[PDB]
Amino acid sequence: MRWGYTSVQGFRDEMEDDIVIRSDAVDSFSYAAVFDGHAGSSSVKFLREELYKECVGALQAGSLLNGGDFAAIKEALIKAFESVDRNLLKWLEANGDEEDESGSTATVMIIRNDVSFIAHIGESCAVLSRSGQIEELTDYHRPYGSSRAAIQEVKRVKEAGGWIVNGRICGDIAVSRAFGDIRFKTKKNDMLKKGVDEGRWSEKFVSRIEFKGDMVVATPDIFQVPLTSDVEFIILASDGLWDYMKSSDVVSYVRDQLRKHGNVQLACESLAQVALDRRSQDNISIIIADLGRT
């Protein structure tokens, strides 16, 4: 297919989104990812090469992609994500910080021949258009809400002994799954301590806390997305887009652009400008795969 992409800072004082698109034409294989970093860019930077390499490795070990073992593909991509996060946390600890507290979300799409898989953590979103109809392919990992993932995430966080205030875990983080974010994982106890030292809560408060598991995890949801000849285009984007434009609206908008000039790169740039005209307040990154059709 053809790719259109854009990644802009918009109204934020820093740019922490990034995008990756890598193809192997001989193998009919492509990897597209949007990363939405927070509290710095070091996690995003790490993921840029490390996640690709690990995913490619996890799936090549066994020529795994089109074997039809969904379970095995799913397990491979999960272990890839978990492994990368393990390595990131070490890196953040040794090649850092000392005040680097960064993290990043990630929505990855892998296509090989006529199969597509999505590995997703966080609050970017992927959608496609199929015979004129929208399919929303991912669900949000937020510690509040009503979608399938939402109730389960809040349950998982509370189960780990964390709490949620102002729609944030420990009043801090607004996503429940992410790479990095060591203070919610292997340094959560230290986190409580720092809070006392910085006067965000009392000593007796920390006493009543009992962390059982990690509050934030990098374990992805994994989806298999059937590809058919009537899939018109696929869109991966950060929440800088979706928070300000409903997916049914973006799909109609892109369809209109492509009917107009058939240029996916121009469609993508014009879409990002619509998001800015609507005064989205975040970095905005968009990747569109134009598969053509009718």
Binding site: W163, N166, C170, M191, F205
Partner: peptide, 10 residues
């Protein structure tokens, strides 16, 4: 919204 914030108890 800013994705992180200084933490707060319930």
């Amino acid at each position: 919204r800013k994705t992180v914030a200084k933490p707060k108890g319930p």
